[PDB]
Amino acid sequence: IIKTGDIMFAVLDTSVNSDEPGPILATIVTGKLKGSKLIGSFNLPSNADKMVITFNTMSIPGAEKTISISAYAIDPNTARTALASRTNHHYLMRYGSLFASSFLQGFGNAFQSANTTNGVRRSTLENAVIGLATVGKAWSQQAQQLFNTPTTVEVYSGTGLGILFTQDVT
Amino acid sequence: IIKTGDIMFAVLDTSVNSDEPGPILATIVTGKLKGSKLIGSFNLPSNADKMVITFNTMSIPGAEKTISISAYAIDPNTARTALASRTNHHYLMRYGSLFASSFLQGFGNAFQSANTTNGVRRSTLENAVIGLATVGKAWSQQAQQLFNTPTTVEVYSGTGLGILFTQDVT
Amino acid sequence: IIKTGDIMFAVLDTSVNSDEPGPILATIVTGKLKGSKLIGSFNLPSNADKMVITFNTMSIPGAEKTISISAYAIDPNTARTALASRTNHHYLMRYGSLFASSFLQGFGNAFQSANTTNGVRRSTLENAVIGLATVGKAWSQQAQQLFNTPTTVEVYSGTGLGILFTQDVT
Amino acid sequence: IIKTGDIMFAVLDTSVNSDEPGPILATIVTGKLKGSKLIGSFNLPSNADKMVITFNTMSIPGAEKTISISAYAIDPNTARTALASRTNHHYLMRYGSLFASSFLQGFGNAFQSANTTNGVRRSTLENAVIGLATVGKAWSQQAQQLFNTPTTVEVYSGTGLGILFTQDVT
């Protein structure tokens, strides 16, 4: 029997990544149900740096079959119902490719319009500056799509958890 | 039996955050129902700096099952029906990307049209000023969406509560 | 019998590539069910650098028929539910064909506009510079389509992996 | 009786080509069924450099008739489920006719615009340079459609391959 709100401590043993949807396994370590296997999933709230892990199957050792369950994983040392061993916003892929393609475009167009009647210029004044103006343009067309890469949240495979049951377990 | 308007004090033992929707657990500390566990949710009113915790399930120690309930969490200090241990308006994510990208755009376009019939310019007159006008423009297009990040309200895990019941308990 | 959450170690004897969809076979090495053949498939989540293997058939040596099954392959020493022995982002066929097709266009248009009204030029002033403006214009047209080639994830044929069963096996 | 996952080594005796749809025959060389005639087809995943061979009819010597079957051809020394003895992207047909058709157009237009009001240019200054702009413009028109020729995958007729059965044989 498990009441509602009964926190029991588990350990993660399947490291999760927000980019790869898959089942997550945890193993209860302390309590009258020691060694039970919790199978669940996760859900990134699309505006948060931590992912919410919900467990929906429990395999008690010595039980005949696995019982459906409603549960959530809270993070000890924070008591928050969200886990993030490492969150990663792509600051060099979304901002390093948006501040470098646009800069190339601007720095090339500036050299192009630096003289107008269209004026005699040296070969490198059109090689490594004006020529890049197009490189930064096309790159920019492929840099706005790189910006929409969601932040990736990874919970490692040794993290302790507090499993909180939101409903009674038969 | 808990009558409508009866207040018993809990302790919010699960830290909550507005970004991540998850269950909220509070253990009643004082009164004739000691150690009872309240499971509920939150709601950000989209125009307030505080969030409303509304408990809707109570598990009494010794009860056969968990009873449905209607309750609200009130801050013991201000007596308001809203909790916020820390409210975070993103003044650097939204006013640091709107005042810096647009400033770069303006500072670049100002150097672009400084002299016009465009005469000879030094390399930094197009590298570090004019070329930025594009990196501040694209950034601007990616900063009008950063402005819509909702304020993050966080209630800690030691926050004492008051529980106001708006319905009779049988 | 196999309970939910039971991890059985297997070796992948069929190398896989994300480009070509095909069945994947894994032979269990350790456990009470040794030598059983797991037939399954794979999925690339279109935003991750690793692929999720979903075994769905198990042939036990000594059985009369192959049993349906639900299991995922987890990568040991990482415990993640995704496998990747080599991940290939085509940084030369997508970015090398986008930074060179567009660079030719800009480098050619710069020489084309390098003098405008007479516009008297040399034979090499239009052979390998201005004449390359058009080809780049074509190449960059065919390089936007090259940018959409998905990354290829390859799991080799010696990769040992755990198998986590998400449902009971009777 | 053949289980699921059983690998039997066969040799191809019908060379295949991705451009020519048709049946592919293989003969099993090792095992208790030495001399069967696997008949199958192929598939090109439209983004891969190798083709997937799938057999769906097996003619055991001495059998009453040929049996419907499910199998895949895996390539030894790689173990991958795809075969390719020679992969041919038409680099000279697609890029040699794109970098020369478009180069002619630009090289001709550059000579055309090399002087504008006074066009005292000589006869060869329009024979094989300016006059080549139009033909190039035609060739580039017939080279965009030529760019979409799919890659040619060829598996030769001495190619030994393993056969992996994904279904039981009765």
Task: Write the single-letter amino acid at B72.
Answer: Y
Mapping DSSP to helix (H, G, I), strand (E, B) and coil, where does residue B68 land? strand
The distance of Cα B36 from the centroid of its chain, to the nearest Å, equals 28
Are residues A72 and B37, on separate chains, in Cβ contact within 8 Å?
no
Q: How far is A99 from chain B (nearest CA, A)?
A: 5
Q: What is the dihedral sign for C-alpha C112, C113, C114, C115?
A: positive
Q: Evaluate whether chains B and A are touching (3 or more beta carbon pairs less than 8 Å apart).
A: yes
Burial label for D107, CB within 10 Å (0-12, 13-18, 19+), is: buried
- The three-point CA angle A150-B46-B155 to 5° equals 80
Q: Which of A37, A59, A132 is opposite residue C106, by nearest beta carbon? A: A132
Q: How far is C41 from chain A (nearest CA, A)?
A: 14
DSSP string covering A4-49:
SS-EEEEEE-S-EETTS---EEEEE-SSSS-S-EEEEEEE--SS-S
Are residues A111 and B117, on separate chains, in Cβ contact within 8 Å?
no
Query: Is residue D165 within 8 Å of D54, Cβ to Cβ?
Result: no
Q: How was this structure determined?
A: cryo-EM
Are residues C126 and D116, on separate chains, in Cβ contact within 8 Å?
no
User: Comparing C-alpha atoms, which of D99, B162, B115, B58 is closest to residue C101?
Assistant: D99
Q: Evaluate whether chains D and A are touching (3 or more beta carbon pairs less than 8 Å apart).
A: no
Query: What are residue A162's DSSP bridge partners?
Result: A9, A74
Q: CA-to-CA distance for B31 and C142, rounded, in angstroms?
A: 75
Which residues of C fall within a CB distance of 8 Å from D84? none
Q: CA-to-CA distance for B40 and B22, rounded, in angstroms?
A: 9
Are residues A81 and B19, on separate chains, in Cβ contact within 8 Å?
no
Q: What is the 3-state secondary structure (H, E, C) of chain C?
A: CECCCCEEEEEECCCEECCCCCCEEEEECCCCCCCCEEEEEEECCCCCCCEEEEEEEEECCCCCCCEEEEEEEECCCCCCCCECCEEECCCCCCCCCCCCHHHHHHHHHHHHCCCCCCCCCCCHHHHCCCHHHHHHHHHHHHHCCHHHCCCEEEECCCCEEEEEECCCEC
Q: Which of C98, C107, C168 is opposite residue A139, by nearest beta carbon? A: C98
Q: CA-to-CA distance for A122 and D117, rounded, in angstroms?
A: 25
Query: Is residue C75 within 8 Å of C51, Cβ to Cβ?
Result: no
Q: CA-to-CA distance for B18 and A82, rounded, in angstroms?
A: 12
Are residues B117 and A114, on separate chains, in Cβ contact within 8 Å?
no
The distance of Cα C84 from the centroid of its chain, to the nearest Å, equals 9
The two tokens of residue C34 are: 């040794």
Mapping DSSP to helix (H, G, I), strand (E, B) and coil, where does residue A146 land? helix
Given CB atoms, is C46 within the 8 Å cutoff of chain D?
no
User: Comparing C-alpha atoms, which of D116, D112, D115 is closest to residue D104?
Assistant: D112
Query: What are residue D169's DSSP bridge partners?
Result: D2
Q: How far is C65 from chain A (nearest CA, A)?
A: 23
Given CB atoms, is A105 within the 8 Å cutoff of chain B?
yes
Q: How far is B3 from chain A (nearest CA, A)?
A: 23
Q: For A106, which residue in chain B has the nearest alpha carbon?
A: B131
Question: Residue B135: which H helix or E strand, with range?
Answer: helix B132-141
Which residues of B fall within a CB distance of 8 Å from A143? 138
